[PDB]
Symmetry: C5
Subunit: 398 residues, 5 copies
């Protein structure tokens, strides 16, 4: 209207969008900086970059944008686009975005007293260190460092307001514990003046329901299935087939864990050593199966069973695991004697083979017990060694 | 021409593209906002972002862009590019695009009465919560929240017009149920004035023909093939080979389901638990096969069959499943006696082995029936537990 | 030079780049629109977006850009960049690009008579419906809809010129049948004036040499190899091994077909049902192998062969498939009688087992013939059911 | 300084950045165009797009940018950014980049005589036809076509200077043979004036060390391992296991070759037919193994060996491949006769089975020789059929 | 304020942002160039491009931006955006970014003496040669070449300041040894004037903990498991099954190494030849297993054991590896003689078969020892042949 047009023409006249809108040129300009977290887009641990949707909030007082409400009836707020009024140069210090700004420049509301208000949105890409030591029971502290690029503490001092949690969309993968912030002053050995900045520490923890059901339970079931080799009879030649097939199945799980894990080489991930232990147990089960088959397929009278081997396997382990089984009339006679002698020799050889097979079965059951104990101990210890494991289980699975 | 050039030179003179084109500066400016959905580009459930091709429609009245048709014959409409006339700052609140605008700024048609008209296109990227609880029988309600960034209800009030469905290209993957909208007013504890906005809720459901034929039918056939282990004779040593190979085949299906599913950890997807049940059934079939082979390859006289084992397997289950099968003249005689005695002992051992093998076959058939029942029950229950399953089947497969 | 500088200074003076360059402000401005297709970048059937390299061609007459050649010797053409002279706002209606323009704005040549000429290049991203019903023997009709955004038929009427095929780089994957176009007028229930637009329908067909050699021939060979199970003797326990391994091999082909196919759920792709039929045949071969092994490994005297089973398998199918094979002196005698009686019983059991094995071989050969017939019929019928299959084969493979 | 500021203020005055800087407006302006290739970023054969880092070099003479060195001491060169002085509109005709320009606009150095100099860098994306007929022994001729967009030969004629090879970073994958160029004139049937352009043909060949060690040697070793089936004895039932496993291993190599090859359907790649031949040989080896096992597991007296079969396998092939192996006293006698008669019958059956097994071994060795010859011939012929194969081997492997 | 506005209005007046701010127009302008490395984003060896987050630091003296502090109380620093004051055109020469600039243009602080200060951030993408000869024990020297685009040494000479390591975020994958820099002058055969530039050589080494635990240890364990074939008895037919399965497992490791390695064909990577040696050892183990099974399954009296074969295997290798095992009354007699003669012949054949089996076992143990030695030697030699292997192990694993 008439009054709004007159006000807009009056305010722009003799206004420099480069000068700091202070009335004395020496007193610092107080700028209240805060943000409003909306959602966490994707925590890319591969490149150690955090992508978030954040609405910044800046509020300062302008001395040259003040008018009288009575003299200009009706109009109470004026908005200026970029390049028309002075704005603070606050931007993310650790921004990993290519543009390095990642802010949509909107208008700046101005009240009758000149109190400007700036709410620039944007999909920020911060760069924070991401440790995967306790993956997937992981808690991350990503930091957003905001501050004026070319203003000191005696010209533009930052004042902090608490972040706005209201309106935050809950990310499925990550749970937001909170976003505490702190205002800090950095000094240089030039001028003895502060360089304040406002930094917000995004504290988030990873949810383990999806990662659990996709990596932990399948691994446990696969290891328990690999333990089945010791129950198959040695007569059927499919023991090492099952062992090598279950190890081949674990290979693709190892590949998946490698593809989802970063290339960080500062610590060993918990799930990495868990999978390593599981695959090592499977390989040792394969070796044990080879030994058991070597015992089972022992040549008749091809060797002598050692006394220690007997007294251990056939007695002590048998009792421990409840085992129980450890003229022409002369020529015809001389000819028929050989058949029965050969049959007796075959029976003795069969008895020796039966002893060897029972020793193999004893080794099978002993290794079944030992590997079950090892698998249970390794799984429980590795899973419960992670901090806040009980909290994550009670909050995800329950 | 002459008249059009004169009109363009007259309208621009003494015009501020920053002022709101109201005649009183206090009466609110009515802006009619609506959109025209064209197609759904891609529903990215991984990042919970919806990509759509939308033509916005804005219509307001400008007081300073009115002329006389008689005084300017021929010209009835004038178009101004960005930065030359005032436009509303309506933009998507929950836009996940990096630019946060995602609108191609076009010209604004102006009638003789000053009624402006704005139709900015753009590939919007909204951020909506996407639940995968009932995947793939899934219905999504994605929300598009539009509103003025820096205008209240007493200066620029939004009026809603129904979305334009005409011209919508049917997306292959998703079926558009509809796009209802609502106008809501948000109040602050500052000024007791409304802050209206227009939000459109895109209601879409996923089609299950592709997902069905790629995930459900192959899984059913794979489970039915895994059930074949109980039909193979135990004489051929290829039972656990088939079982472990079919489980290895299910492993890649699990990997695919993990790759197409988001990392959301708020609920267990229906197809996720379906695949888990199928693979658990396959693993239990492998365990049962191990038990059956242990029964089949039982050493002759290496143990005693328990009385309960006999009375169950060889009688009750046999009847339930229709089983039927549960001087020198003295020396020659003494020598030939041993051969027949050994043959009789071998025959008795063979009879015991036959009893054990029949018990193994009985267990095989019992487990075949039990696992067929379990697979059918699990598949039917999980598939029919999802809401609107019948609608999706009748609309996709028929 | 002097004359060119004078002409440039004269033309710009009193020129508005916003007015339509018509001499009467009521007669429509004729704009001749045409394009010049250069190459097809990538037909992304996943998102139903077509990417092409197109040089647009626009020609209109400007009334205010006319000068005298004699008065300005030497200079015959003047070029103005964007924002200096009026240009039509023609753009792709169904553009799926984020910028929605995808045009590099070049200069506009102007002749002495004011006939402007505009050739803006650009990598357009159109959105066309892509059906995969007859994949890979597929013919696509993608549509490029061009028209003025904010001009009617009484101010800027579009005139169509045929597309320029000369200079088109032949895309390897797709063969360009042609690009016919049509000019259509859309009417609104407001003003009874046309809204013309020029739309070009890109008609292209997919070449099947690469898709053939990568998907069809390997599938045929894999199915023919799966047919080999019926030729292996049942004595060697590696039948179901071969069957399950060939099915596992087909699994990755199914995964590839799923990865290259869109998520469209409006029709079943031809190659999809072809692969489904092949894998179903392989699974049925596995089931048949299980049945054959069940027949082969039949216990001696563990059951009675049914009369119908005999009269079918051992006679009718045997003839159909040319099968041919369907004091102390008393004690010694009484003792030796048992050995020969046991041997006779073993021989009878061996004869019964031989009958069962011959029945298994007969079933093997019958199923070999039946599955060969089924595979041939399914492959030929599915491949030849597609339209223009003969054209694609004669144009790709020959 | 003073003189530089005076010169800059003088040159800009009465200067139009739109006019061609010629002194007569009819004589053509000579522009010397050349480029300086730095590196080849990536040759994307999938989309037939070449990405290169190129520094363009343009030099023309400006008539209005001449000053006196004595009158302006110290200053000898002036630089103007974009939009301040006239520049040629030379750009890549076949640019596949979305922006279609892909040039970073820098300043233009001007000497005292007005000789301008322009060196705009940029990551160009040209579109060249890429044939994969002789992959990986491939030589590509990608073309970069540069020319003025809206200038003829009588206003702006292009003069060519040889490309600058100095400073070219050697790309690891591709070897740069050279970049010859040619200046050509295109005529239209309008005006009988040339339209010159400068095109540079980038001639590059692919290095085969990486592709060799990753695709050729592994394939050769895999085929040689597949040849081992004929050496395994038929007693162990693991022949077809090895054959089908090696074929399954070749399947992933086929998948890799498909993933690295474009979708071009104009010719069959050399490595494609090489892999096809290798996999066909493996499949034929599997079929031969099936035949050999059918011969080996032949039922005793289940058929008659044909006379031709005998005279070939047991004699001619045996000699060719050095094979060598082709009252109560009556009752007891009548009872014991049967045992020896049965043993004699078993011995005759064993002799027949031994003949069949020797025939199977003869077939095994014959097929070993034949398949070794076939594999060697196919590999050598396919590898040496490619042109410049010897050059690529001597330059990569040596 | 008043003084700041007056100063800003005074400085801009009669200022040309194109002239070099020197007081004599002949003396060179000293520009101090330095950078501040923050983090290494990703070292993409595939395209030989290095992505880093770098804050540039430029400092020069401006003659026209000097004012009096006393005359303008309070204001001590003024900031000008892009296009308002002269700035050096320093940019990365070897930038591989599409924009080629990759710098966020910020304000330029100016002191009372005119000493400007420029700190433009940006995510630079340099192009450096990346050799993978010693992967993963790799040390890279990537070079960042900065220099003025269109200024010589007599107008704008570059002065170098050491790079700022403080504030560098430690990248997980790469360890930063240091970033030494050097200032060099390039001369042309035109003018005998220097063209200085400042280049920083980023020296970084790859950490081997992740690559170690994912590629080296699994390969060692897989090779050691492949060595287990020689321990399995030949009676169980699962030797070549284990060998071919472990080779199939190594196939996916080869695929992973190919996917993570660049396409460079100038040298053979260390891990590439390591994996090649491991897979060659596995293949040779498979061949040895085939030979061993051929020896084990030798037909009775189907050939004669060579004298050299005996004296080697059964004696010398047996001792080397501690092996130990290398009227009617006439008719009945004549009938019973045959049974014992046949049994004696069978016993002799069994003895020959036992000799062959012992020879096979001797070959098995000899090959076990030989392949263990070969695997150990190859692994140790290849791993320790890389330079700084001990440093990388002591710094990553310890
Ligand atoms: N999560 S991970 O870091 O990617 C990962 C997962 C599993 C795994 C490793 C790494 C390697 C580190 C330790 C052993 C090695 C491997 C293995 C291979 C063969 C056998 Br027999 C036994 C064990 N197991
Ligand atoms: N769709 S999914 O969420 O990716 C998915 C699919 C299948 C599946 C799971 C997850 C895991 C969760 C439950 C068991 C576990 C796994 C499994 C592994 C070995 C055996 Br023996 C039996 C069962 N089955
Ligand atoms: Ca993530
Ligand atoms: Ca999707
Ligand atoms: Ca495609
Ligand atoms: Ca490539
Ligand atoms: Ca990397």
């Amino acid at each position: 209207g008439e009054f709004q047009r007159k006000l807009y023409k009056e305010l722009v006249k003799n206004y420099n969008p480069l000068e700091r809108p202070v009335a004395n040129d020496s007193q610092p300009l107080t700028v209240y900086f805060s943000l409003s977290l909306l959602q966490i887009m994707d925590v890319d641990e591969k490149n150690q970059v955090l992508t978030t949707n954040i609405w910044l909030q800046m509020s300062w007082t302008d001395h040259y944008l003040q008018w009288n409400v009575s003299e200009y009836p009706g109009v109470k707020t004026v908005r200026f686009p970029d390049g028309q009024i002075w704005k603070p140069d606050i931007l993310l210090y650790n921004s990993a975005d290519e543009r390095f700004d990642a802010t949509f420049h909107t208008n700046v509301l101005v009240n009758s007293s000149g109190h400007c208000q700036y709410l620039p949105p944007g999909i920020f890409k911060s760069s924070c260190y991401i440790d995967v030591r306790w993956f997937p029971f992981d808690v991350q502290h990503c930091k957003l460092k905001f501050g004026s690029w070319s203003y000191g503490g005696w010209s533009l001092d930052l004042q902090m307001q608490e972040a706005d949690i209201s309106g935050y969309i809950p990310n499925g993968e990550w749970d937001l514990v909170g976003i505490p912030g702190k205002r800090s002053e950095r000094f240089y050995e030039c001028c003895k003046e502060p360089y304040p900045d406002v930094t917000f520490t995004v504290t988030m923890r990873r949810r383990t329901l999806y990662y659990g059901l996709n990596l932990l339970i399948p691994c446990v079931l696969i290891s328990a299935l690999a333990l089945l080799v010791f129950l198959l009879p040695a007569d059927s030649g499919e023991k090492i087939s099952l062992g090598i097939t279950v190890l081949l199945s674990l290979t693709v799980f190892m590949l998946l864990v490698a593809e989802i894990m970063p290339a960080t080489s500062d610590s060993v991930p918990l799930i990495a050593q868990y999978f390593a232990s599981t695959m090592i147990i499977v390989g040792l089960s394969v070796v044990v199966t080879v030994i058991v088959l070597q015992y089972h397929h022992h040549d008749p009278d091809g060797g002598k069973m050692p006394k220690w081997t007997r007294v251990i396997l056939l007695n002590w382990c048998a009792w421990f695991l409840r085992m129980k089984r450890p003229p022409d009339l002369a020529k015809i006679l001389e000819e028929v004697r050989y058949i029965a002698n050969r049959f007796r020799c075959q029976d003795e050889s069969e008895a020796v083979c039966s002893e060897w097979k029972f020793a193999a079965c004893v080794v099978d059951r002993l290794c079944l017990m030992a590997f079950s104990v090892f698998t249970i101990i390794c799984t429980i210890g590795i899973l419960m060694s992670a901090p806040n494991f009980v909290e994550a289980v009670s909050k995800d699975f329950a």
